Amino acid sequence: MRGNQMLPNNHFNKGSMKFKNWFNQPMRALKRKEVREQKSKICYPNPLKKLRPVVRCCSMRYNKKVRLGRGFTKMEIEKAGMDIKYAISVGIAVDLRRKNKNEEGLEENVKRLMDYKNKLKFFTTVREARDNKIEQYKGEIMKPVNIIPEVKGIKVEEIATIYG
Amino acid sequence: MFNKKSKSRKLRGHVSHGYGRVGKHRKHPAGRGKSGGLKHLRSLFQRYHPDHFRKLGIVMFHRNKNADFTRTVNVSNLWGLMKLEEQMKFKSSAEVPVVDCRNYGYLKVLGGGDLSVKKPIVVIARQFTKDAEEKINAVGGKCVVAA
Amino acid sequence: MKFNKNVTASRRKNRKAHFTSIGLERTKLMNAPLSKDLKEEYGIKRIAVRPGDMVKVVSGEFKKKEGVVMKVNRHDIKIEVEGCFVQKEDGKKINKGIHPSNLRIIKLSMEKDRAEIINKKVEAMKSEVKA
Amino acid sequence: MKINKLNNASKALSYPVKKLAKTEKAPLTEKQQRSKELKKFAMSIAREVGGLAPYELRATELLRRDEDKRCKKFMKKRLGSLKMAKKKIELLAEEMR
RNA sequence: AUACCACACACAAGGGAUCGUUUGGCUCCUGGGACGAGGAAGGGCGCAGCAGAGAGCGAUAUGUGUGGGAGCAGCAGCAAUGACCACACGUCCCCGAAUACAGCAUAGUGCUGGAGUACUCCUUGGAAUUAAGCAUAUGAGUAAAGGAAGGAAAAGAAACUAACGAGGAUUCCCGUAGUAGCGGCGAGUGAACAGGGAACAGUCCAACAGUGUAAUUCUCAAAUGAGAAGUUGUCAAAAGGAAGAAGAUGUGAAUCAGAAAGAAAAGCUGAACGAUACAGGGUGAUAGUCCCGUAGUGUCUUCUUACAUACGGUGAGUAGCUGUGCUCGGUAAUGCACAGUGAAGAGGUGGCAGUGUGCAUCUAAGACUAAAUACAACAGGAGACCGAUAGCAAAGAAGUAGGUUGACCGAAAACAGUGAAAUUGUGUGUGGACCCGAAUGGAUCGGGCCCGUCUUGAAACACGGACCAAGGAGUGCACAUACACUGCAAGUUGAGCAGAGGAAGUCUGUGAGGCGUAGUGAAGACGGAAAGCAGUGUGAGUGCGACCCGAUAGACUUGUGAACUAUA
RNA sequence: UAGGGGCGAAAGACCAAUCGAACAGUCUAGUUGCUGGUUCCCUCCGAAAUGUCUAUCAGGACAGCGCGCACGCAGAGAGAAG
Mode of pairing for the β-strands spanning C54-57 and C103-107: antiparallel
Q: What is d(CA A164, CA B122) in angstroms, rounded to the nearest whole number?
A: 7
Contact between C116 and C125 (Cβ < 8 Å): no
Report the C-alpha gap between D96 and D71 in whole angstroms: 15
**Contacting residues of A for D15, CB less than 8 Å apart:** 63
Q: Are B68 and B108 in contact (CB under 8 A)?
A: no
Q: Give chain C's end-to-end CA distance (angstroms, integer).
A: 27
Q: Do chains D and B touch (3 or more CB pairs under 8 A)?
A: yes
Q: Which of C33, C36, C44, C52 is nearest to C105 (CA)?
A: C33
The set of residues, in sequence order, having a beta carbon less than 8 Å from that of C89 and lying 6+ positions away, is none
- Which one, of A141, A120, A116, lies nearest residue A45 by Cα? A120
Residue D54 phi, psi (nearest 5): -45, -45
From the Cβ of C12, is strand E under 7 Å away? yes
D14 is in an annotated binding site: yes
* Direct distance between the N- and C-terminal alpha carbons of chain D, in angstroms, rounded to an integer: 68
Q: What is the dihedral of CA B81, B82, B83, B89, to 10 degrees?
A: -150
Beta-carbon neighbour count of residue B141 at 10 Å? 21
Classified as helix, coil or strand, A149 is: coil
Closest CA to A112 of A73, A139, A142, A91: A142
- Say if CB A152 and CB B98 are below 8 A apart: yes
- List the determination method: cryo-EM
Q: Return d(Cα A117, Cα C75) in angstroms, integer.
A: 76
On chain A, the residues whose CB falls within 8 A of the CB of D11 are 60
Cα distance between residue A114 and residue A82, in whole Å? 10
DSSP state of A75: H
Q: Are B101 and B109 in contact (CB under 8 A)?
A: yes
Dihedral angle sign, alpha carbons of residues B115, B120, B126, B128: positive
Distance CA C86, CA C94 (A): 6
Residues 76-135 in A contacting D (C-alpha not used; CB under 8 Å)? 100-104, 106
**Between the CA of residue C85 and those of A140, C32, C64, C82, C96, what are the distances in Å?**
81, 21, 15, 8, 5
The Cβ of residue A51 has, within 10 Å, a number of other Cβ atoms equal to 21
- Shortest CB distance from B98 goes to which of A8, A151, A156? A151
Q: Are A21 and A62 in contact (CB under 8 A)?
A: no
User: CB under 8 Å to B53, separation ≥6 — which residues?
Assistant: B37, B38, B45
Q: Which one, of A49, A97, A91, A89, lies nearest residue A73 by Cα?
A: A97
One-letter identity of residue B115: L
Q: How far apart are CA D72 and CA D93, in angstroms?
A: 12
Give the relative orientation of helices D68-79 and D82-96 as an angle to the nearest 10 degrees: 130
Burial of A153 (0-12, 13-18, 19+ CB in 10 A): middle
| C18/C21 Cα distance (integer angstroms) | 6
**What span, in angstroms and rounded, lies between the C-alpha atoms of D66 and B105?**
68
Which amino acid is it at C36? K
> Could A102 and D15 be called an inter-chain contact, meaning their C-beta atoms sit closer than 8 Å?
no
Distances (CA, A) of B47 to A2, B32, B42, C115, D71: 12, 20, 9, 103, 67
* Residues in CB range of C77: below 8 A, 6 or more apart: C29, C30, C99, C100
Cα torsion angle, B81, A155, A164, A144, sign: negative
Alpha-carbon separation of residue D33 from A31, D23, D25, D40 (angstroms): 59, 21, 15, 11
What HEC string does B65-97 produce?
CCCCECCEEEHHHHHHHCCHHHHHHHCCCCCEE
Residue of C98, C108, C131 whose CA lies nearest to C46: C108
Q: Which nucleotide is nearest to D17 (CA to C1')?
A: E165
Contacts of B107 in chain D (CB under 8 A): 5-6
Amino acid at C23: G
Q: How far does the CA of A43 sit from the C1' of E378, in Å? A: 37
Nucleotides of E under 7 A from a protein CB: 22-24, 28-31, 68-73, 80, 82, 84-86, 130-132, 138-143, 158, 162-169, 176-178, 180-182, 185-196, 198-202, 243-245, 247-248, 250-253, 263-266, 277-284, 287, 290-296, 298, 312-314, 319-322, 329, 331, 341-345, 347-348, 351-352, 354-356, 361-362, 373, 375, 380-383, 452-456, 474-475, 477-481, 484-485, 491, 497-505, 511-529, 535-547, 550
Residue type, position A35, single letter? V
Rg (CA), chain C: 18
Nucleotide nearest to B6 (CA to C1'): E538
Q: Is C19 helix (H, G, I), strand (E, B) or coil?
A: helix
Q: Is A164 close to B34, i.e. CB distance below 8 A?
A: no
Q: Name the nearest CA neighbour of B135 among B96, B84, B77.
A: B77
| Cα-Cα end-to-end distance for chain A | 60
Distance E510 C1' – A141 CA (angstroms): 14
Which phi and psi (to 5°) does residue B23 adopt?
-80, -35
The partner residues of D4 in beta bridges, in order of sequence, read: none
With beta carbons less than 8 A apart as the criterion, state whether B122 and B142 touch. Answer: yes
CA B32: distance to chain centroid?
A: 33
DSSP code string of A11-64: ----TT------TTHHHHHHHHHHHHHHHHHHTTTS-SS-B--EEE-SSTTTTT
**CA A133/CA A120 separation, integer angstroms:** 16
Q: Do C66 and C123 meet the contact criterion of CB atoms below 8 Å apart?
A: no
The phi and psi torsions of A32 (rounded to 5 degrees) equal: -60, -40
CA distances from B102 to A55, A126, B73, D2, D79 (A): 19, 51, 11, 16, 55
The phi and psi torsions of A162 (rounded to 5 degrees) equal: -125, 150
Q: Is the CB of D25 under 7 A from strand E?
A: no
The residues near A21 (Cβ < 8 Å, ≥ 6 apart) are none
Q: Helices D54-64 and D82-96 sit at what angle, rounded to 10 degrees?
A: 70
Residue A68 neighbours by CB distance under 10 Å:
15
Q: How far apart are CA C108 and CA C46, in angstroms?
A: 11
* Residue A101 contacts residue D19 (beta carbons within 8 Å): yes
Cβ of A56 near strand E (under 7 Å)? The reply is: yes
Residue nearest to nucleotide F37 (CA to C1'): B15
Q: How many CA atoms lie within 13 A of A150 on its CB side?
A: 5
Return the CA Rg of chain B.
29
The bridge status of strand B142-145 relative to strand C31-33 is unpaired
CA distance C126 to C124: 6
The DSSP code sequence of chain D is --BS-S-HHHHT------B----------HHHHHHHHHHHHHHHHHHHHH---HHHHHHHHHHHTT-HHHHHHHHHHHHS-HHHHHHHHHHHHHHH-
In chain A, residues with a C-beta closer than 8 Å to the C-beta of B86 are: 151
Name A154's Cβ contacts closer than 8 Å, sequence gap at least 6: A162, A164, B95, B96, B98, B122
CA angle at residue B80 from B75 to B120, to 5 degrees?
Answer: 55
- Tell me the resolution in Å: 10.8
Instruction: Report the nearest residue to nucleotide E505, CA vs C1'.
Output: A26
Question: In chain C, which residue ranges form alpha helices assigned H by DSSP?
Answer: 11-19, 23-27, 38-41, 114-129
The whole-number Å distance from A17's CA to F26's C1' is 20
Three-state secondary structure string covering chain B: CCCCCCCCCCCCCCCCCCCCCCCCCCCCCCCCCCCCCCCCCHHHHHHHCCCCCCCCCCCCCCCCCCCCECCEEEHHHHHHHCCHHHHHHHCCCCCEEEEEHHHHCCCEEECCCCCCCCCCCEEEECEECHHHHHHHHHCCCEEEECC
Measured distance CA(C117)–CA(C47) in Å, rounded:
10
Question: In chain A, what's the furthest Cα-to-Cα distance?
Answer: 81
Sign of CA dihedral D71, D74, D76, D79: negative
Per the rule left: phi > 0, alpha: psi between -120 and 50, beta: everything else, A14 is beta
